[PDB]
Design an enzyme around this catalytic site. Structure first.
Site, mmCIF file in Angstrom:
data_model
loop_
_atom_site.group_PDB
_atom_site.id
_atom_site.type_symbol
_atom_site.label_atom_id
_atom_site.label_comp_id
_atom_site.label_asym_id
_atom_site.label_seq_id
_atom_site.Cartn_x
_atom_site.Cartn_y
_atom_site.Cartn_z
ATOM 1 N N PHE A 159 46.138 60.869 4.929
ATOM 2 C CA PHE A 159 46.335 61.749 5.976
ATOM 3 C C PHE A 159 46.711 63.201 5.489
ATOM 4 C CE2 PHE A 159 45.543 63.202 9.935
ATOM 5 C CZ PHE A 159 46.768 63.822 10.820
ATOM 6 N N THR B 185 42.922 54.194 17.934
ATOM 7 C CA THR B 185 43.695 53.219 16.902
ATOM 8 C C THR B 185 43.312 51.807 17.317
ATOM 9 O OG1 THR B 185 45.368 54.895 16.409
ATOM 10 C CG2 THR B 185 45.541 52.974 15.500
ATOM 11 N N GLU C 276 51.760 51.361 9.351
ATOM 12 C CA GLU C 276 53.213 51.821 10.066
ATOM 13 C C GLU C 276 53.746 50.970 11.076
ATOM 14 O OE1 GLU C 276 54.411 55.878 8.258
ATOM 15 O OE2 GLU C 276 55.298 53.990 8.681
ATOM 16 N N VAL D 174 49.343 51.949 3.744
ATOM 17 C CA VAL D 174 50.449 51.670 4.757
ATOM 18 C C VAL D 174 49.952 51.500 6.305
ATOM 19 C CG1 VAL D 174 52.649 53.016 5.751
ATOM 20 C CG2 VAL D 174 52.010 53.118 3.382
ATOM 21 N N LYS E 50 52.187 53.288 19.582
ATOM 22 C CA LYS E 50 50.558 52.988 19.275
ATOM 23 C C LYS E 50 50.115 52.214 18.230
ATOM 24 C CE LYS E 50 48.966 55.937 16.062
ATOM 25 N NZ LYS E 50 47.683 55.732 15.158
ATOM 26 N N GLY F 245 53.073 64.633 0.922
ATOM 27 C CA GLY F 245 52.345 63.505 1.389
ATOM 28 C C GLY F 245 50.938 63.558 0.839
ATOM 29 N N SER F 246 50.549 62.612 -0.080
ATOM 30 C CA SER F 246 49.294 62.685 -1.050
ATOM 31 C C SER F 246 48.383 61.542 -0.266
ATOM 32 C CB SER F 246 49.793 62.189 -2.336
ATOM 33 O OG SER F 246 50.482 60.987 -2.477
HETATM 34 N N1 LIG Z 1 45.518 57.672 7.826
HETATM 35 C C1 LIG Z 1 45.333 58.124 8.945
HETATM 36 O O1 LIG Z 1 44.150 58.221 9.553
HETATM 37 C C2 LIG Z 1 46.600 58.764 9.888
HETATM 38 C C3 LIG Z 1 47.817 58.854 9.240
HETATM 39 N N2 LIG Z 1 48.746 59.373 9.956
HETATM 40 C C4 LIG Z 1 50.019 59.057 9.418
HETATM 41 O O2 LIG Z 1 50.440 59.729 8.161
HETATM 42 C C5 LIG Z 1 51.459 59.060 7.599
HETATM 43 C C6 LIG Z 1 50.759 59.109 5.997
HETATM 44 O O3 LIG Z 1 50.071 57.989 5.920
HETATM 45 P P1 LIG Z 1 48.614 57.687 5.079
HETATM 46 O O4 LIG Z 1 47.734 57.268 6.193
HETATM 47 O O5 LIG Z 1 48.569 59.128 4.568
HETATM 48 O O6 LIG Z 1 49.024 56.515 3.790
HETATM 49 P P2 LIG Z 1 48.306 56.259 2.534
HETATM 50 O O7 LIG Z 1 48.508 54.555 2.952
HETATM 51 O O8 LIG Z 1 46.950 56.835 2.652
HETATM 52 O O9 LIG Z 1 49.221 56.589 1.608
HETATM 53 C C7 LIG Z 1 50.696 56.187 1.264
HETATM 54 C C8 LIG Z 1 51.582 57.262 0.789
HETATM 55 O O10 LIG Z 1 52.750 56.929 0.700
HETATM 56 C C9 LIG Z 1 53.008 57.054 -0.695
HETATM 57 N N3 LIG Z 1 53.760 55.731 -1.265
HETATM 58 C C10 LIG Z 1 53.487 54.312 -1.163
HETATM 59 N N4 LIG Z 1 54.576 53.649 -1.564
HETATM 60 C C11 LIG Z 1 55.717 54.449 -1.753
HETATM 61 C C12 LIG Z 1 56.851 53.964 -1.991
HETATM 62 N N5 LIG Z 1 56.973 52.793 -2.494
HETATM 63 N N6 LIG Z 1 57.696 55.178 -2.246
HETATM 64 C C13 LIG Z 1 57.217 56.205 -1.919
HETATM 65 N N7 LIG Z 1 56.197 56.697 -1.614
HETATM 66 C C14 LIG Z 1 55.289 55.748 -1.518
HETATM 67 C C15 LIG Z 1 51.917 57.452 -1.698
HETATM 68 O O11 LIG Z 1 52.067 57.834 -2.599
HETATM 69 C C16 LIG Z 1 51.081 58.009 -0.418
HETATM 70 O O12 LIG Z 1 51.766 59.352 -0.502
HETATM 71 C C17 LIG Z 1 51.739 57.944 8.092
HETATM 72 O O13 LIG Z 1 53.061 58.036 8.658
HETATM 73 C C18 LIG Z 1 50.792 57.601 9.190
HETATM 74 O O14 LIG Z 1 51.336 57.083 10.595
HETATM 75 C C19 LIG Z 1 48.759 59.886 11.271
HETATM 76 C C20 LIG Z 1 47.361 60.221 11.583
HETATM 77 C C21 LIG Z 1 46.168 59.342 11.197
HETATM 78 C C22 LIG Z 1 45.449 58.614 12.331
HETATM 79 O O15 LIG Z 1 45.630 59.211 13.700
HETATM 80 C C23 LIG Z 1 46.392 57.439 12.408
HETATM 81 O O16 LIG Z 1 47.355 57.611 13.360
HETATM 82 C C24 LIG Z 1 45.664 56.227 11.755
HETATM 83 O O17 LIG Z 1 46.156 54.754 12.544
HETATM 84 P P3 LIG Z 1 46.444 53.758 11.388
HETATM 85 O O18 LIG Z 1 46.766 52.692 12.446
HETATM 86 O O19 LIG Z 1 47.668 54.099 10.961
HETATM 87 O O20 LIG Z 1 45.352 53.604 10.508
#
Ligand SMILES: NC(=O)c1c[n+]([C@@H]2O[C@H](COP(=O)([O-])OP(=O)(O)OC[C@H]3O[C@@H](n4cnc5c(N)ncnc54)[C@H](O)[C@@H]3O)[C@@H](O)[C@H]2O)ccc1[C@H](O)C(=O)COP(=O)(O)O
Ligand SMILES: NC(=O)c1c[n+]([C@@H]2O[C@H](COP(=O)([O-])OP(=O)(O)OC[C@H]3O[C@@H](n4cnc5c(N)ncnc54)[C@H](O)[C@@H]3O)[C@@H](O)[C@H]2O)ccc1[C@H](O)C(=O)COP(=O)(O)O
Lengths: 349, 349
Positions: B18, B259, B292, B290, B202, B14-15
């Site tokens: 988060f 959130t 979610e 993303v 949430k 997961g790059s």
């Molecule tokens: N960002 C946060 O603050 C946060 C994020 N999460 C979770 O972390 C998970 C990873 O999300 P991310 O935020 O790290 O997302 P980027 O959008 O930053 O990364 C996209 C990733 O997906 C890959 N990617 C993109 N397209 C593709 C395709 N097509 N194929 C394969 N891989 C792909 C890309 O290479 C990256 O690795 C996701 O399930 C989130 O719900 C939990 C806790 C917190 C926070 O507490 C939190 O919950 C935040 O709330 P919020 O409302 O969500 O902001």
């Protein structure tokens, strides 16, 4: 009965931001609303300006709201009475000016709605308990929820709880207070203890949230403080005999999360200033609005000690507010517990 | 024992924001941290810049964090594995690239920490259930709490829950993930169902909070949405067999309140744009991160229907996101219920 009730007259004892905001709500429901303020010159100014320039600047009063310094003119003919005098001034009001009000309320069995939040310094009483020394308890209900005065006063969507020992009283008041434009919506409950405990404690926690902000901590920390703080509300409620339905409702969770999350909260703002390094004596010297958590922190601690309820966050906030504990030392001691289980009970089997 | 554990190596699959944030946490606890990213050109860029310029701009990576596109090099010698791939992409990772990782984790019994939040479209599965098709349950734990990436990555005070069926596993992971500068603090629990339901729902509710803000509603309205929304988390958790201890803990109340209250939330931001009048198709094509909640909202509705759980807010949010429903119409339908009791059950006698 989801149909609204309307009155001829309401009286609001409470000329501050929130008393004025609730007068604005009642102006939609009543032909006439009277608001009592202690100083006659200030009353004349507010009436002339059609604006509470003292405590709710920028909000034009409805025409059917009139301020007065005459207690008897205020309550005469009133069909509901609201108390929104700050906690540490409530007793003085009844001692000095309440005799004929009491006889009126008793005579005409006028519903009283307590909107004040806090705990009284020496007696450790909640606002409705203070009022209950002067008025019969069956006339008393409690209003509590996430309800910033400025939003309430200008008709921006707000939900509150109304708590009364008798649910049918709460439901009646809910029909009086709720508006047909759906700007102000009340929800009935019987958990009067949970409501008043949550209301008083949430202001102390909000100082804590402000301290976190002033120390440079972020939103993640705030969320953690809200979550752990609610446990303290929950434990005190249990010890005081409340059934706890309010804890995760509007009075508890809703109001706690609201007040901990905005500089619109006077308590949050006090906290922020303490975290930035100002002494409480200077905060309170230059403040033009009541921060109930400041005076509540000490009697809250004494009440919790009495009941053997551990309130770790509220204890450290009390140390900061009343014992001049450096906020960073308070933080350090708070986090000196080491790793633990979340430790919440299951809701389900 | 509340003494911290330190590892030789951790791997983060997961790059994103988060995953990179959690690698920053793990860089304080591990000699080496590898972050897997699917694209080698971008891996080289990130490694050269010592910054995740793709998904976490402005934060300089610790020197002991290395990005790689080679799965086998990523996990080799790792003593903990984190999955932080977004929900709808998790399956594809295991099917296309996970074969040797799966054998390694099984053979060496390497603890796996699931940090992804959501529900998968066809299957209605939570992220740990997707992963649980490929890896056995005793290796899986779930991380959940109010933990915005930017604050986590830069070491601003954060609390999270770690859930595992065996509390001793959760407590071990708590010792591995928590930091000695007290910047990242974990709380152990066994309510894995509660954590994952809260985490998924949430995000949908946060879209709703955003909609409220974009419609010009205030903080009182937000507080009411948070309070009512948590009931939907609670009810779904009950139906799915969780014990519910996480609902008013960090995973539920904490993360929801966070959130729903900040534009740092991708889901809040989607909501705000929807509330301001933008169509979902324009939102999604200009999106760089993303949300979610968007993809979750569909399977969430199907799962709730399947379980006969009413989720009034999530239902309206689903209608706005998927069925072109005017946000103002959604609001009206929500507010057409008439006056009610708060109706929360007592916690005590
Ligand atoms: N960002 C946060 O603050 C946060 C994020 N999460 C979770 O972390 C998970 C990873 O999300 P991310 O935020 O790290 O997302 P980027 O959008 O930053 O990364 C996209 C990733 O997906 C890959 N990617 C993109 N397209 C593709 C395709 N097509 N194929 C394969 N891989 C792909 C890309 O290479 C990256 O690795 C996701 O399930 C989130 O719900 C939990 C806790 C917190 C926070 O507490 C939190 O919950 C935040 O709330 P919020 O409302 O969500 O902001
Ligand atoms: N303001 C709000 O948004 C709010 C306020 N309350 C409560 O309403 C009560 C009244 O306070 P107020 O906000 O109306 O206060 P001002 O500070 O605006 O008014 C001061 C009044 O006190 C009198 N006064 C001042 N000094 C004296 C002396 N010395 N003697 C006698 N009388 C005096 C003066 O004439 C005014 O009538 C108090 O118990 C609050 O806890 C509840 C709900 C909300 C919100 O939901 C809420 O809880 C807000 O959280 P927070 O963190 O509190 O902002």
């Amino acid at each position: 009965k989801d149909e609204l009730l309307y009155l001829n007259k309401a009286v609001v004892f409470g000329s501050g931001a929130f008393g004025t905001a609730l007068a604005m709500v009642l102006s939609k429901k009543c032909r006439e609303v009277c608001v009592w303020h202690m100083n006659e010159e200030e009353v004349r100014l507010v009436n002339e300006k059609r604006e509470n320039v003292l405590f709710l600047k920028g909000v034009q009063l409805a025409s059917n709201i009139t301020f007065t310094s005459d207690v008897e003119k205020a309550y005469n003919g009133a069909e509901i009475i609201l108390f929104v005098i700050p906690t540490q001034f409530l007793r003085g009001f009844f001692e000095k000016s309440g005799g004929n009000l009491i006889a009126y309320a008793k005579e005409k069995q006028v519903p009283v709605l307590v909107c004040t939040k806090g705990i009284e310094r020496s007696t450790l009483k909640f606002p409705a308990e203070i009022i209950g020394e002067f008025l019969p308890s069956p006339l008393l209900s409690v209003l509590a929820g996430p309800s910033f005065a400025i939003e309430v006063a200008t008709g921006v969507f707000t939900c509150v709880s109304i708590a009364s020992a008798d649910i049918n009283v709460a439901r009646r008041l809910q029909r009086i207070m709720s508006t047909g434009d759906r700007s102000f919506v009340c929800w009935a409950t019987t958990d009067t203890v949970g409501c008043e405990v949550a209301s008083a404690v949430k202001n102390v926690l909000a100082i804590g949230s402000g301290v976190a902000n002033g120390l440079g901590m972020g939103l993640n920390a705030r969320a953690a403080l809200i979550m752990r703080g609610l446990l303290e509300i929950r434990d005190l409620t249990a010890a005081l005999g409340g059934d706890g339905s309010a804890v995760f409702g509007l009075a508890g969770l809703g109001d706690l999360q609201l007040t901990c999350s905005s500089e619109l909260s006077r308590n949050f703002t006090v906290g922020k200033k303490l975290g930035k390094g100002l002494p409480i004596e200077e905060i309170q010297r230059t403040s033009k609005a009541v921060a109930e958590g400041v005076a509540t922190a000490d009697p809250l601690m004494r009440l919790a000690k009495q009941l053997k309820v551990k309130m770790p966050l509220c204890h450290q906030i009390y140390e900061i507010v009343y014992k001049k504990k450096n906020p960073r030392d308070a933080l350090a001691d708070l986090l000196s517990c080491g790793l633990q289980d979340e430790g919440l009970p299951p809701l389900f089997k």
